[PDB]
UniProtKB/Swiss-Prot annotation:
It is a lipid-anchor. Ras proteins bind GDP/GTP and possess intrinsic GTPase activity. Plays an important role in the regulation of cell proliferation. Plays a role in promoting oncogenic events by inducing transcriptional silencing of tumor suppressor genes (TSGs) in colorectal cancer (CRC) cells in a ZNF304-dependent manner. It catalyses: GTP + H2O = GDP + phosphate + H(+). The modification N-acetylthreonine is found at residue 3. This is GTPase KRas. CDD domains: H_N_K_Ras_like (cd04138). InterPro entries: P-loop_NTPase, Small_GTP-bd, Small_GTPase, Small_GTPase_Ras-type. The modification N-acetylmethionine is found at residue 2. GTP binds at residues 11-19, 30-36, 60-61, 117-120. The gene is KRAS. Changing residue 23 to E: In CFC2; exhibits an increase in intrinsic and guanine nucleotide exchange factor catalyzed nucleotide exchange in combination with an impaired GTPase-activating protein-stimulated GTP hydrolysis but functional in interaction with effectors. Changing residue 62 to H: In lung carcinoma. Pfam families: Ras. It comes from Homo sapiens (Human). Changing residue 14 to D: In GASC, JMML and OES; also found in a breast carcinoma cell line; somatic mutation.
Length: 170
């Protein structure tokens, strides 16, 4: 089979995980999507000449059983860590997601991309500099996105694939 990349989108409720995923997969902005629905979505794409499958889990937070969270973190190859640029708590929550994924995977080297979503809004509490400082500290890319306008969306997901590739080559 062509290569499949198992991607996981994490972040506080309301940051735009579902909107980002639907924009990536379907090329539409869906502005209302039940915050409690967690599902996976698939898309066949070409990234840097490679035809591959993206298998993307749009997470929604607590699970019936914590074992289910641990399972998707172990299975997942790369993580989009999403905050919203107008929600400081969502940015602070990134520290927890970074930790928890590393902890479950028992790894110091987990492909991740920091994503600051809702960049179409002038209303902003997290400046680009602050997010760059966090991404620098993690040694990962940082991309500002808008699920609404599609700015940065392919970049976020494709950059995460490229980070998975760099991890694999070791
Ligand atoms: N302006 C704007 N609103 C967004 C964007 N992404 C999501 N939203 C809105 O933010 C809210 C939460 O989005 P949702 O995709 O449900 O977030 P999730 O809980 O992380 O899955 C909804 O009201 C969306 O319309 C974006 O890039 N720009
Ligand atoms: Mg959602």
């Amino acid at each position: 089979g062509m290569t499949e990349y198992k991607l996981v989108v994490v972040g506080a409720c309301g940051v735009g995980k579902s909107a980002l995923t639907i924009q990536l997969i379907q090329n539409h902005f869906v502005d209302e999507y039940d915050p409690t629905i967690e599902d996976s979505y698939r898309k066949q794409v070409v990234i840097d000449g490679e035809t591959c499958l993206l298998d993307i889990l749009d997470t929604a937070g607590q699970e019936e059983y914590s074992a289910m969270r641990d399972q998707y973190m172990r299975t997942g190859e790369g993580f989009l860590c999403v905050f919203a640029i107008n929600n400081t708590k969502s940015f602070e929550d990134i520290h927890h997601y970074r930790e928890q994924i590393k902890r479950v995977k028992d790894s110091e080297d987990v492909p991740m991309v920091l994503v600051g979503n809702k960049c179409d809004l002038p209303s902003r509490t997290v400046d680009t500099k602050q997010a760059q400082d966090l991404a620098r500290s993690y040694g990962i890319p940082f991309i500002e996105t808008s699920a609404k306008t599609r700015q940065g969306v392919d970049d976020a997901f494709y950059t995460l694939v490229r980070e998975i590739r760099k991890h694999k080559e070791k």
